[PDB]
Short mmCIF file of C-alpha atoms and ligand atoms in Angstrom, two decimals:
data_model
loop_
_atom_site.label_atom_id
_atom_site.label_comp_id
_atom_site.label_asym_id
_atom_site.label_seq_id
_atom_site.Cartn_x
_atom_site.Cartn_y
_atom_site.Cartn_z
CA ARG D 1 -39.61 -57.53 16.89
CA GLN D 2 -38.23 -54.90 17.76
CA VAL D 3 -39.31 -51.37 17.30
CA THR D 4 -37.84 -47.79 16.83
CA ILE D 5 -40.27 -44.81 15.57
CA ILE D 6 -39.62 -41.50 15.96
CA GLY D 7 -42.01 -38.75 16.51
CA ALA D 8 -45.15 -39.16 18.42
CA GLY D 9 -47.61 -36.91 16.80
CA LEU D 10 -50.80 -38.76 15.27
CA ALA D 11 -49.41 -41.66 12.52
CA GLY D 12 -46.28 -42.79 15.00
CA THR D 13 -48.20 -43.19 18.19
CA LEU D 14 -50.90 -44.53 16.55
CA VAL D 15 -48.11 -47.53 14.81
CA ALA D 16 -46.68 -47.64 18.09
CA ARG D 17 -50.34 -48.76 19.85
CA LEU D 18 -50.23 -51.28 16.94
CA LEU D 19 -46.81 -52.47 16.76
CA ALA D 20 -47.15 -53.16 20.63
CA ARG D 21 -50.49 -55.34 21.04
CA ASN D 22 -49.58 -57.55 17.84
CA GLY D 23 -46.17 -58.14 20.09
CA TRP D 24 -43.67 -55.91 19.47
CA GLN D 25 -41.08 -54.13 20.91
CA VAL D 26 -41.59 -51.15 20.44
CA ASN D 27 -39.72 -47.39 21.61
CA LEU D 28 -40.81 -44.09 19.70
CA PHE D 29 -38.97 -40.51 20.72
CA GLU D 30 -40.61 -37.41 20.17
CA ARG D 31 -38.60 -34.52 20.09
CA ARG D 32 -41.16 -32.01 22.53
CA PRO D 33 -42.01 -32.52 26.31
CA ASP D 34 -44.95 -35.34 27.72
CA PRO D 35 -47.91 -32.88 26.89
CA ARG D 36 -49.91 -34.75 28.88
CA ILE D 37 -48.72 -33.16 31.70
CA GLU D 38 -51.36 -29.79 33.86
CA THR D 39 -50.30 -26.94 33.01
CA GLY D 40 -51.86 -22.90 33.77
CA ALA D 41 -52.16 -22.90 29.42
CA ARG D 42 -55.17 -22.89 27.45
CA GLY D 43 -52.82 -23.90 24.69
CA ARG D 44 -52.33 -23.53 21.01
CA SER D 45 -55.88 -25.51 20.31
CA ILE D 46 -55.58 -26.57 16.60
CA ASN D 47 -59.29 -28.37 15.56
CA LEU D 48 -58.37 -31.27 12.97
CA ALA D 49 -61.67 -32.85 10.87
CA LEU D 50 -61.77 -36.05 11.44
CA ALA D 51 -63.66 -38.13 8.64
CA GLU D 52 -64.67 -42.08 8.17
CA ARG D 53 -61.39 -42.79 6.69
CA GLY D 54 -58.95 -41.76 9.89
CA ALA D 55 -62.20 -42.95 13.08
CA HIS D 56 -61.57 -46.48 10.70
CA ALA D 57 -58.36 -46.78 11.89
CA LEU D 58 -58.84 -45.37 14.89
CA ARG D 59 -61.55 -48.43 15.26
CA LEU D 60 -58.49 -51.00 14.58
CA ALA D 61 -56.79 -49.95 17.78
CA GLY D 62 -59.59 -49.59 19.91
CA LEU D 63 -59.65 -46.21 20.34
CA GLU D 64 -62.32 -44.72 18.10
CA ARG D 65 -65.08 -43.96 21.40
CA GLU D 66 -62.25 -42.41 23.93
CA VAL D 67 -61.57 -39.84 20.31
CA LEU D 68 -65.18 -38.98 19.59
CA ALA D 69 -66.26 -38.75 23.40
CA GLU D 70 -65.25 -35.06 22.60
CA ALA D 71 -65.43 -34.56 19.23
CA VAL D 72 -67.93 -32.34 17.69
CA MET D 73 -69.97 -32.90 14.58
CA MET D 74 -70.15 -31.26 11.31
CA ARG D 75 -73.21 -32.55 9.96
CA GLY D 76 -72.56 -30.01 6.76
CA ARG D 77 -70.15 -26.85 5.19
CA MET D 78 -71.72 -23.50 5.77
CA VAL D 79 -70.88 -21.49 3.22
CA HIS D 80 -71.12 -17.79 4.04
CA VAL D 81 -71.88 -15.24 1.63
CA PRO D 82 -72.46 -11.46 2.56
CA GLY D 83 -75.31 -10.64 0.95
CA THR D 84 -76.14 -14.14 1.37
CA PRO D 85 -78.22 -16.60 3.68
CA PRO D 86 -75.71 -18.99 4.89
CA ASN D 87 -76.51 -22.22 3.09
CA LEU D 88 -76.16 -25.37 5.16
CA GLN D 89 -74.68 -27.88 2.64
CA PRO D 90 -75.46 -31.44 4.49
CA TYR D 91 -73.15 -34.01 4.35
CA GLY D 92 -74.47 -36.33 1.75
CA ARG D 93 -78.08 -36.98 0.16
CA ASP D 94 -78.91 -37.94 3.87
CA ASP D 95 -77.15 -37.52 7.23
CA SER D 96 -75.60 -40.33 8.50
CA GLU D 97 -72.13 -39.75 7.30
CA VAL D 98 -70.96 -36.45 9.65
CA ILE D 99 -66.62 -35.11 9.59
CA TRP D 100 -66.17 -34.40 13.16
CA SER D 101 -63.69 -31.65 14.54
CA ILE D 102 -61.10 -33.99 17.79
CA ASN D 103 -58.92 -31.08 19.32
CA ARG D 104 -55.46 -32.35 18.16
CA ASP D 105 -53.93 -31.56 21.41
CA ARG D 106 -56.92 -33.54 22.43
CA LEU D 107 -56.02 -36.78 20.01
CA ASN D 108 -52.21 -37.16 20.86
CA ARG D 109 -52.58 -37.44 23.78
CA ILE D 110 -55.48 -40.51 23.57
CA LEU D 111 -53.15 -41.73 21.42
CA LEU D 112 -50.13 -41.45 23.80
CA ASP D 113 -51.99 -43.06 26.09
CA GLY D 114 -52.84 -45.89 24.03
CA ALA D 115 -49.73 -46.23 22.95
CA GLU D 116 -48.46 -47.08 26.14
CA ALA D 117 -50.95 -49.32 27.55
CA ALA D 118 -50.33 -51.48 24.41
CA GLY D 119 -46.38 -51.59 25.52
CA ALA D 120 -45.06 -49.14 24.30
CA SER D 121 -41.97 -46.95 25.62
CA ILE D 122 -41.73 -43.13 24.75
CA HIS D 123 -39.16 -40.80 25.55
CA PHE D 124 -39.62 -37.43 25.48
CA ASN D 125 -37.37 -34.17 24.60
CA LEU D 126 -35.45 -36.57 22.40
CA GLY D 127 -34.71 -34.91 18.47
CA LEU D 128 -33.68 -37.32 15.71
CA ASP D 129 -30.11 -35.44 14.36
CA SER D 130 -28.31 -38.23 11.99
CA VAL D 131 -29.05 -41.66 10.95
CA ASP D 132 -26.03 -44.66 10.79
CA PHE D 133 -26.96 -47.07 8.15
CA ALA D 134 -23.96 -48.63 8.46
CA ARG D 135 -23.50 -49.41 11.93
CA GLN D 136 -27.66 -48.40 12.64
CA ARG D 137 -27.01 -45.86 15.31
CA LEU D 138 -29.44 -42.84 15.84
CA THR D 139 -28.11 -40.02 17.32
CA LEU D 140 -30.63 -38.14 19.17
CA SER D 141 -30.13 -34.83 21.00
CA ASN D 142 -32.34 -33.06 23.89
CA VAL D 143 -32.41 -28.75 24.03
CA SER D 144 -30.02 -29.27 27.02
CA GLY D 145 -27.26 -30.00 24.83
CA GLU D 146 -26.76 -33.82 25.49
CA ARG D 147 -26.16 -36.06 22.99
CA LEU D 148 -27.23 -39.79 22.92
CA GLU D 149 -26.80 -42.74 20.74
CA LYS D 150 -29.26 -45.45 20.12
CA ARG D 151 -28.96 -48.91 18.71
CA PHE D 152 -32.09 -49.62 16.42
CA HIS D 153 -33.66 -52.29 13.73
CA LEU D 154 -36.28 -50.97 11.56
CA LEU D 155 -37.28 -47.38 11.95
CA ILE D 156 -40.43 -45.51 12.08
CA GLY D 157 -39.87 -42.23 10.42
CA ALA D 158 -42.78 -40.65 11.59
CA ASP D 159 -42.05 -37.19 12.34
CA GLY D 160 -43.93 -34.89 10.14
CA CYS D 161 -43.69 -32.47 6.83
CA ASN D 162 -39.83 -31.52 7.77
CA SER D 163 -38.85 -35.60 8.29
CA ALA D 164 -35.13 -35.33 9.78
CA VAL D 165 -35.52 -39.46 9.23
CA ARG D 166 -36.45 -38.46 5.55
CA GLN D 167 -33.51 -36.14 5.57
CA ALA D 168 -30.90 -38.96 7.12
CA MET D 169 -32.63 -41.17 4.19
CA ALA D 170 -31.62 -38.83 1.36
CA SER D 171 -27.75 -38.94 2.36
CA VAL D 172 -27.81 -42.61 1.49
CA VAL D 173 -30.18 -42.89 -1.18
CA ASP D 174 -32.05 -40.45 -3.54
CA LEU D 175 -35.74 -40.07 -3.34
CA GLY D 176 -36.25 -38.73 -6.21
CA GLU D 177 -38.11 -35.25 -4.32
CA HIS D 178 -40.17 -33.12 -5.88
CA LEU D 179 -41.12 -29.55 -4.00
CA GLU D 180 -43.75 -28.17 -5.68
CA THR D 181 -45.52 -25.25 -3.27
CA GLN D 182 -48.30 -23.60 -2.62
CA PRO D 183 -48.60 -20.01 -2.76
CA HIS D 184 -50.79 -19.63 -0.06
CA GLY D 185 -48.83 -19.30 4.42
CA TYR D 186 -52.36 -19.45 6.36
CA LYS D 187 -52.90 -17.84 9.52
CA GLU D 188 -54.71 -19.29 12.83
CA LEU D 189 -57.66 -16.80 14.51
CA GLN D 190 -60.13 -17.81 17.32
CA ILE D 191 -63.68 -16.78 17.09
CA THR D 192 -65.38 -16.83 21.42
CA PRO D 193 -67.93 -18.88 22.41
CA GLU D 194 -69.07 -15.44 23.61
CA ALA D 195 -68.82 -14.17 20.18
CA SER D 196 -69.63 -17.96 18.94
CA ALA D 197 -73.36 -18.12 20.56
CA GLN D 198 -74.52 -13.77 20.41
CA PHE D 199 -73.58 -14.61 16.26
CA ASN D 200 -76.40 -17.90 16.43
CA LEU D 201 -72.92 -19.15 14.64
CA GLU D 202 -73.78 -23.42 14.47
CA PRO D 203 -71.15 -25.17 16.23
CA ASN D 204 -72.46 -28.35 15.01
CA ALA D 205 -71.12 -27.54 11.03
CA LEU D 206 -67.85 -26.43 8.88
CA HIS D 207 -67.94 -22.54 8.18
CA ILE D 208 -66.05 -21.39 5.35
CA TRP D 209 -65.64 -18.00 3.47
CA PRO D 210 -65.05 -17.92 -0.34
CA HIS D 211 -62.76 -15.59 -1.04
CA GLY D 212 -61.48 -15.89 -4.43
CA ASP D 213 -57.40 -15.99 -4.22
CA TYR D 214 -57.75 -16.43 0.03
CA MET D 215 -60.95 -17.91 2.36
CA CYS D 216 -61.12 -18.71 5.88
CA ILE D 217 -62.55 -21.84 7.03
CA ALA D 218 -64.00 -22.46 10.98
CA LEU D 219 -64.31 -25.57 12.20
CA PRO D 220 -66.10 -25.90 16.21
CA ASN D 221 -64.66 -27.35 19.49
CA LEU D 222 -67.21 -29.12 22.44
CA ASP D 223 -66.44 -24.98 24.28
CA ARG D 224 -68.17 -23.33 21.06
CA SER D 225 -65.62 -21.85 20.26
CA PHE D 226 -64.70 -21.96 16.63
CA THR D 227 -60.70 -21.94 15.33
CA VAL D 228 -60.20 -20.16 12.06
CA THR D 229 -57.63 -20.55 9.44
CA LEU D 230 -56.79 -17.59 6.93
CA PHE D 231 -55.78 -18.47 3.64
CA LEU D 232 -53.79 -16.25 1.86
CA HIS D 233 -50.38 -15.17 -0.40
CA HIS D 234 -47.52 -14.42 1.52
CA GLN D 235 -46.18 -12.22 -0.84
CA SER D 236 -48.34 -10.47 -4.65
CA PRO D 237 -47.80 -12.58 -7.37
CA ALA D 238 -47.08 -10.20 -10.40
CA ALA D 239 -49.61 -10.19 -12.01
CA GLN D 240 -51.77 -8.60 -10.25
CA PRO D 241 -49.27 -6.31 -7.40
CA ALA D 242 -51.57 -5.15 -5.15
CA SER D 243 -53.76 -7.98 -4.32
CA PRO D 244 -54.17 -9.38 -0.53
CA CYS D 245 -51.34 -11.26 1.01
CA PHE D 246 -49.57 -11.41 4.14
CA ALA D 247 -46.53 -9.17 3.72
CA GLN D 248 -48.98 -5.90 3.46
CA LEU D 249 -50.67 -7.38 6.80
CA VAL D 250 -48.14 -5.63 9.54
CA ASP D 251 -50.33 -5.88 12.01
CA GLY D 252 -53.47 -7.09 13.76
CA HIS D 253 -54.73 -3.06 12.41
CA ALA D 254 -53.69 -3.80 8.92
CA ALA D 255 -54.83 -7.39 9.48
CA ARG D 256 -58.03 -6.19 11.26
CA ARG D 257 -58.55 -3.47 7.70
CA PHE D 258 -58.26 -6.14 5.90
CA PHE D 259 -60.90 -8.59 7.98
CA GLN D 260 -63.58 -5.63 7.62
CA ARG D 261 -63.12 -4.90 4.22
CA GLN D 262 -62.67 -8.21 2.59
CA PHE D 263 -65.04 -9.99 5.73
CA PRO D 264 -66.89 -7.93 7.13
CA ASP D 265 -69.65 -10.52 8.65
CA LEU D 266 -66.53 -12.41 9.73
CA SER D 267 -64.20 -10.33 11.22
CA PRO D 268 -67.72 -9.35 14.14
CA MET D 269 -66.33 -12.42 15.80
CA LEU D 270 -62.90 -11.99 15.36
CA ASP D 271 -62.41 -10.34 19.07
CA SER D 272 -58.56 -10.88 19.67
CA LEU D 273 -58.23 -10.94 15.65
CA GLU D 274 -54.78 -7.92 16.35
CA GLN D 275 -53.89 -10.57 19.52
CA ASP D 276 -53.53 -13.37 17.60
CA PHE D 277 -52.54 -12.41 14.11
CA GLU D 278 -48.73 -10.89 15.63
CA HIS D 279 -48.65 -13.56 18.03
CA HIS D 280 -49.69 -16.70 15.55
CA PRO D 281 -46.91 -17.49 13.05
CA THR D 282 -48.19 -17.81 9.68
CA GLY D 283 -48.00 -21.14 8.91
CA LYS D 284 -46.48 -22.62 5.28
CA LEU D 285 -47.95 -25.46 2.86
CA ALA D 286 -46.44 -27.36 0.17
CA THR D 287 -47.03 -30.69 -1.73
CA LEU D 288 -43.45 -32.93 -1.38
CA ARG D 289 -43.87 -35.87 -3.79
CA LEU D 290 -40.59 -38.58 -3.05
CA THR D 291 -40.08 -42.27 -5.36
CA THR D 292 -39.33 -44.01 -2.64
CA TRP D 293 -40.46 -44.46 1.54
CA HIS D 294 -38.16 -46.57 2.33
CA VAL D 295 -33.98 -48.35 2.80
CA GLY D 296 -34.08 -51.81 2.24
CA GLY D 297 -35.68 -53.29 5.58
CA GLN D 298 -33.62 -50.40 8.05
CA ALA D 299 -35.92 -47.27 7.60
CA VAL D 300 -39.54 -46.28 5.82
CA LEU D 301 -41.68 -43.09 6.32
CA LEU D 302 -45.12 -42.73 7.23
CA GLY D 303 -47.48 -39.85 7.63
CA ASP D 304 -46.52 -36.57 6.77
CA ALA D 305 -43.12 -37.52 6.52
CA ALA D 306 -43.30 -39.35 3.61
CA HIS D 307 -46.34 -36.93 1.88
CA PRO D 308 -46.98 -33.34 3.10
CA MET D 309 -50.34 -31.92 1.32
CA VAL D 310 -52.59 -29.46 1.08
CA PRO D 311 -54.94 -29.05 4.02
CA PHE D 312 -57.45 -28.23 1.40
CA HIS D 313 -59.29 -32.17 1.81
CA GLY D 314 -59.20 -31.72 5.46
CA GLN D 315 -57.25 -34.78 5.31
CA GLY D 316 -53.45 -35.14 5.92
CA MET D 317 -54.53 -37.29 9.43
CA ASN D 318 -56.44 -39.04 8.64
CA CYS D 319 -54.10 -39.86 5.41
CA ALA D 320 -51.82 -40.51 8.16
CA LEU D 321 -53.65 -42.54 10.51
CA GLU D 322 -54.63 -44.53 8.04
CA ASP D 323 -50.68 -45.06 6.45
CA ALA D 324 -50.07 -46.57 10.20
CA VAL D 325 -53.03 -49.05 10.17
CA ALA D 326 -51.24 -50.40 6.19
CA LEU D 327 -47.84 -49.64 7.56
CA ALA D 328 -48.84 -52.69 11.34
CA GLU D 329 -50.71 -54.41 8.24
CA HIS D 330 -47.45 -55.05 6.53
CA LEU D 331 -45.58 -55.82 9.10
CA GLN D 332 -46.81 -57.80 10.80
CA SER D 333 -48.04 -60.30 7.06
CA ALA D 334 -44.69 -60.50 5.76
CA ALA D 335 -41.17 -62.63 5.75
CA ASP D 336 -39.32 -59.15 6.90
CA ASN D 337 -38.52 -56.04 7.45
CA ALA D 338 -37.49 -55.10 3.33
CA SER D 339 -40.75 -57.17 1.94
CA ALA D 340 -42.79 -55.01 4.12
CA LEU D 341 -41.68 -51.37 3.85
CA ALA D 342 -41.44 -51.79 -0.45
CA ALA D 343 -44.78 -53.66 -0.45
CA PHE D 344 -45.90 -50.65 2.13
CA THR D 345 -45.24 -48.56 -0.18
CA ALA D 346 -45.81 -49.96 -3.60
CA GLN D 347 -49.99 -50.00 -1.45
CA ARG D 348 -50.05 -46.65 -0.18
CA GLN D 349 -47.53 -44.33 -2.80
CA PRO D 350 -50.62 -44.24 -5.00
CA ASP D 351 -53.34 -43.48 -2.86
CA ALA D 352 -51.03 -40.10 -1.46
CA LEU D 353 -50.11 -39.40 -4.54
CA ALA D 354 -54.12 -39.16 -5.62
CA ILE D 355 -55.11 -37.00 -1.92
CA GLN D 356 -52.45 -35.02 -2.99
CA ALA D 357 -53.77 -33.92 -6.17
CA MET D 358 -57.28 -33.89 -4.84
CA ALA D 359 -55.98 -31.78 -2.01
CA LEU D 360 -54.55 -29.20 -4.29
CA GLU D 361 -57.84 -29.67 -6.73
CA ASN D 362 -60.39 -28.79 -3.76
CA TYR D 363 -58.94 -25.32 -2.89
CA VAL D 364 -60.78 -24.10 -6.42
CA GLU D 365 -64.23 -25.48 -5.13
CA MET D 366 -63.90 -23.66 -2.01
CA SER D 367 -63.02 -20.64 -2.97
CA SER D 368 -64.66 -19.48 -5.57
CA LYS D 369 -67.73 -17.36 -4.36
CA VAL D 370 -70.06 -17.78 -7.27
CA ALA D 371 -69.75 -21.19 -9.41
CA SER D 372 -69.73 -21.44 -12.84
CA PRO D 373 -72.34 -22.44 -14.70
CA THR D 374 -70.41 -25.79 -16.02
CA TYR D 375 -69.90 -26.70 -11.98
CA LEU D 376 -73.09 -26.10 -11.76
CA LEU D 377 -75.05 -27.81 -13.99
CA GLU D 378 -72.44 -30.59 -13.77
CA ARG D 379 -73.17 -30.77 -10.01
CA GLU D 380 -77.06 -31.54 -9.69
CA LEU D 381 -76.48 -33.83 -12.91
CA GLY D 382 -73.80 -35.48 -10.83
CA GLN D 383 -76.84 -35.84 -7.09
CA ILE D 384 -79.41 -36.91 -9.04
CA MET D 385 -77.47 -39.74 -10.83
CA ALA D 386 -76.21 -40.04 -7.36
CA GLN D 387 -79.15 -40.52 -6.33
CA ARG D 388 -80.44 -44.01 -9.23
CA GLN D 389 -76.98 -45.64 -9.05
CA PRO D 390 -75.70 -45.28 -5.47
CA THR D 391 -73.91 -48.49 -6.20
CA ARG D 392 -71.52 -46.86 -9.10
CA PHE D 393 -72.13 -42.91 -9.03
CA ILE D 394 -70.52 -41.70 -5.76
CA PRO D 395 -69.50 -37.77 -5.36
CA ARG D 396 -66.11 -37.80 -5.55
CA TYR D 397 -66.03 -35.57 -2.05
CA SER D 398 -67.86 -38.58 -0.14
CA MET D 399 -65.30 -40.65 -1.98
CA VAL D 400 -62.48 -39.19 -0.05
CA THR D 401 -64.45 -38.24 3.37
CA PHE D 402 -67.48 -40.64 3.82
CA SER D 403 -65.77 -43.46 2.98
CA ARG D 404 -62.95 -46.26 2.70
CA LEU D 405 -62.18 -46.26 -0.88
CA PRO D 406 -58.20 -46.05 -1.42
CA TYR D 407 -57.91 -42.54 -2.79
CA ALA D 408 -56.49 -43.83 -6.06
CA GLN D 409 -58.93 -45.45 -6.46
CA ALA D 410 -61.65 -42.82 -5.77
CA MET D 411 -59.58 -40.35 -8.01
CA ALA D 412 -59.81 -43.26 -11.35
CA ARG D 413 -63.57 -43.32 -10.38
CA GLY D 414 -63.91 -39.13 -10.18
CA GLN D 415 -61.49 -38.96 -13.59
CA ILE D 416 -64.19 -41.69 -15.63
CA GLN D 417 -67.50 -39.60 -13.68
CA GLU D 418 -66.27 -35.80 -14.55
CA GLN D 419 -65.54 -37.02 -18.00
CA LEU D 420 -69.29 -38.50 -18.21
CA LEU D 421 -70.94 -34.87 -16.12
CA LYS D 422 -68.69 -33.43 -18.49
CA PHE D 423 -70.32 -33.92 -21.59
CA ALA D 424 -73.26 -35.03 -20.66
CA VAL D 425 -73.33 -30.93 -20.17
CA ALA D 426 -71.62 -29.19 -22.82
CA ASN D 427 -74.28 -27.18 -24.72
CA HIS D 428 -77.16 -27.38 -22.81
CA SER D 429 -78.32 -24.60 -20.26
CA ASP D 430 -80.02 -26.46 -17.22
CA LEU D 431 -81.36 -29.60 -16.73
CA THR D 432 -83.82 -29.02 -18.80
CA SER D 433 -82.37 -30.17 -22.35
CA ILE D 434 -80.81 -32.93 -20.20
CA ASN D 435 -82.38 -36.60 -20.49
CA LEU D 436 -81.66 -37.68 -17.34
CA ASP D 437 -82.39 -42.36 -18.74
CA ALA D 438 -79.63 -41.17 -21.43
CA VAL D 439 -77.59 -40.89 -18.62
CA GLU D 440 -78.24 -43.04 -16.21
CA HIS D 441 -78.02 -45.68 -19.11
CA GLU D 442 -74.25 -44.25 -20.00
CA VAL D 443 -73.31 -44.27 -15.69
CA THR D 444 -74.05 -47.58 -15.91
CA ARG D 445 -72.29 -48.33 -19.50
CA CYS D 446 -68.82 -46.74 -18.23
CA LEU D 447 -69.15 -47.02 -14.13
CA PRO D 448 -68.12 -50.70 -13.21
CA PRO D 449 -70.38 -51.41 -9.25
C1 FAD E 1 -53.57 -25.86 8.53
C2 FAD E 1 -54.07 -27.39 8.87
C3 FAD E 1 -55.06 -27.88 8.60
C4 FAD E 1 -55.21 -29.50 8.23
N1 FAD E 1 -56.37 -29.74 8.57
C5 FAD E 1 -55.96 -31.11 8.76
C6 FAD E 1 -58.28 -31.07 8.73
O1 FAD E 1 -58.67 -30.84 9.20
N2 FAD E 1 -57.82 -33.58 8.48
C7 FAD E 1 -56.63 -33.82 8.19
O2 FAD E 1 -56.30 -35.72 8.82
N3 FAD E 1 -55.07 -33.31 8.69
C8 FAD E 1 -55.21 -31.66 9.11
N4 FAD E 1 -53.62 -30.84 8.35
C9 FAD E 1 -52.28 -32.37 8.58
C10 FAD E 1 -52.59 -33.09 8.97
O3 FAD E 1 -52.09 -31.72 10.82
C11 FAD E 1 -51.16 -33.56 8.90
O4 FAD E 1 -51.85 -34.35 8.03
C12 FAD E 1 -51.22 -34.84 10.08
O5 FAD E 1 -51.11 -34.58 11.56
C13 FAD E 1 -49.19 -35.96 10.32
O6 FAD E 1 -49.22 -36.07 10.81
P1 FAD E 1 -48.22 -36.92 11.86
O7 FAD E 1 -47.80 -37.81 11.99
O8 FAD E 1 -47.45 -37.97 10.32
O9 FAD E 1 -47.22 -35.49 11.82
P2 FAD E 1 -47.39 -34.84 12.77
O10 FAD E 1 -48.53 -34.44 13.39
O11 FAD E 1 -46.87 -33.03 12.71
O12 FAD E 1 -46.28 -35.78 14.07
C14 FAD E 1 -44.98 -35.75 14.00
C15 FAD E 1 -44.75 -35.83 15.41
O13 FAD E 1 -43.69 -35.26 15.31
C16 FAD E 1 -42.24 -35.30 16.19
N5 FAD E 1 -41.17 -34.79 15.55
C17 FAD E 1 -40.85 -33.67 14.62
N6 FAD E 1 -39.95 -33.89 14.40
C18 FAD E 1 -39.05 -34.43 15.06
C19 FAD E 1 -37.68 -35.11 15.10
N7 FAD E 1 -36.56 -34.54 15.22
N8 FAD E 1 -37.28 -35.21 16.40
C20 FAD E 1 -37.90 -35.85 17.00
N9 FAD E 1 -39.75 -36.21 16.61
C21 FAD E 1 -39.84 -35.24 15.75
C22 FAD E 1 -43.27 -33.56 16.12
O14 FAD E 1 -42.47 -32.71 17.07
C23 FAD E 1 -44.82 -34.68 16.78
O15 FAD E 1 -44.74 -35.90 18.24
C24 FAD E 1 -53.52 -29.77 8.71
C25 FAD E 1 -52.13 -29.61 8.69
C26 FAD E 1 -52.61 -27.93 8.55
C27 FAD E 1 -51.45 -27.86 8.17
C1 7ZR E 2 -62.29 -32.09 -10.75
O1 7ZR E 2 -63.68 -31.90 -10.76
C2 7ZR E 2 -64.62 -32.53 -10.47
C3 7ZR E 2 -65.00 -34.04 -10.11
C4 7ZR E 2 -64.91 -34.51 -9.20
C5 7ZR E 2 -66.57 -34.86 -9.65
S1 7ZR E 2 -67.79 -35.63 -9.44
O2 7ZR E 2 -67.18 -37.85 -10.27
O3 7ZR E 2 -66.94 -36.79 -7.82
N1 7ZR E 2 -69.39 -36.28 -9.46
C6 7ZR E 2 -69.36 -35.09 -8.19
N2 7ZR E 2 -69.55 -35.02 -6.80
C7 7ZR E 2 -70.76 -33.82 -6.69
C8 7ZR E 2 -70.62 -33.32 -5.25
C9 7ZR E 2 -71.41 -33.09 -4.60
C10 7ZR E 2 -72.20 -32.64 -3.85
C11 7ZR E 2 -71.37 -31.30 -3.07
C12 7ZR E 2 -70.00 -31.80 -3.35
N3 7ZR E 2 -69.35 -30.70 -3.10
O4 7ZR E 2 -68.12 -31.45 -2.92
O5 7ZR E 2 -69.67 -29.26 -2.18
C13 7ZR E 2 -69.74 -32.35 -4.67
C14 7ZR E 2 -71.57 -33.86 -7.88
S2 7ZR E 2 -71.13 -34.38 -8.75
C15 7ZR E 2 -67.10 -33.37 -10.31
C16 7ZR E 2 -66.12 -32.52 -10.41
O6 7ZR E 2 -66.46 -31.67 -11.08
C17 7ZR E 2 -66.28 -30.63 -11.54
N1 KYN E 3 -60.29 -29.35 7.10
C1 KYN E 3 -60.22 -28.44 6.25
C2 KYN E 3 -58.88 -27.34 6.97
C3 KYN E 3 -58.22 -26.90 5.20
C4 KYN E 3 -59.03 -26.76 4.59
C5 KYN E 3 -59.88 -27.39 4.18
C6 KYN E 3 -60.32 -28.47 5.15
C7 KYN E 3 -61.35 -29.39 4.81
O1 KYN E 3 -61.61 -29.62 6.35
C8 KYN E 3 -61.55 -30.39 4.00
C9 KYN E 3 -63.29 -30.40 3.22
N2 KYN E 3 -63.80 -32.01 3.62
C10 KYN E 3 -64.24 -29.71 2.77
O2 KYN E 3 -63.99 -30.25 0.78
O3 KYN E 3 -63.66 -28.66 2.11
#
């Protein structure tokens, strides 16, 4: 039937295309101006990691080829630690599995074009303000001030981590929200193609410079430049009041000092550091959990609107595209919007909750320069079991990243798997001491195919 979608980011535009193909009258409203008009700007140039999960959703929409055409392939993770040979941990035990680096703005344009080619009407320069649920009315506003009321039948809030739809819903039901804040902010920097080729930075990998309480990440672009993200506390905790934070970094020069002392091997590749640091705003992170994502058959949330998460597993978009697929499936196969929205929430909620936890946990893996003898021993054993039983023992990263297993099933399995490894490894100094066959027997006993 009819649907009104608020937000033409990743979730909203994908879901609009799918509803529009399956014969829905679709209207998508977007606060921002159409980004497809050509200008003299270079842009923000944000990079996102697209995994098998998200790529699959795009495959379902018939958009995979177009998106992949502009993606840079990442074959492994490259971990840079000073006084160390930058070691490339490939993705898998083979190299069929990959992660793609796609420019966020390219992706969005592909998506918009795909939304319209399916029949969706997109309306830019219009932000949701309010929602009258009793009288089924929407109020939008344009920056020039004016207001515009539209009726609606189904409302889809795909309007991002500060969703106004979610906010409107909260006015009329209790969403049981729990906000968990992240002490890290982030800041976007760049490594130019000039700098990139000079340092022989491998373009075809994900780069990370771990630093404990803070770290940098780098995904590459078609032009061989890299987009770089610094995760750092906003403020130093009470305990260690001298530790690095954004507060102490009060201009490019303090920032350059910070980088030259703490990231000596990364700093010389960051030519425009001072500029980037003063102009680009410091971003905030948070995990937000809701018990309910819908109001009867009137309104549902998906993507970041429904479940903001920390970026540490690189799965936010991947999850959002997955949500879009699931929502359209439900809306299509259900007796009514009510059944469809409930059914959607019941399916996707557990998965949102699972990746939200896994992303929070992923921080410390990425962040520690030297892993502990325990984690390293477990990881060694886990690879060995992964070779011997690829139907049963699949490392959690791979379940999440390189597979389509529901996020919750990944979590549940990684729970059993890690338990297995922990007990196998305790009171052992290294693999010498561990009988592999006994461990394989336990893997087989404990983990269903
Ligand atoms: C630093 C950082 C790094 C990340 N890296 C990755 C990664 O590597 N891989 C990955 O999969 N995910 C990553 N993510 C997360 C990912 O970007 C998000 O989960 C994804 O963008 C969510 O998509 P969405 O459609 O639900 O929300 P959005 O993409 O934010 O889209 C909502 C759309 O909302 C429109 N909008 C907002 N408010 C209104 C309004 N009031 N009225 C009308 N329209 C509105 C927005 O302007 C936009 O058009 C990262 C996030 C951050 C912060
Ligand atoms: C909470 O912690 C864990 C949670 C889950 C697992 S697991 O069950 O999924 N098993 C395993 N994953 C790997 C693995 C292998 C190769 C590279 C990577 N990698 O992310 O770079 C991981 C090795 S063992 C292990 C854990 O270890 C502490
Ligand atoms: N894009 C990101 C942004 C911030 C933090 C991590 C990422 C990742 O790429 C996740 C990757 N799969 C990882 O295991 O570290």
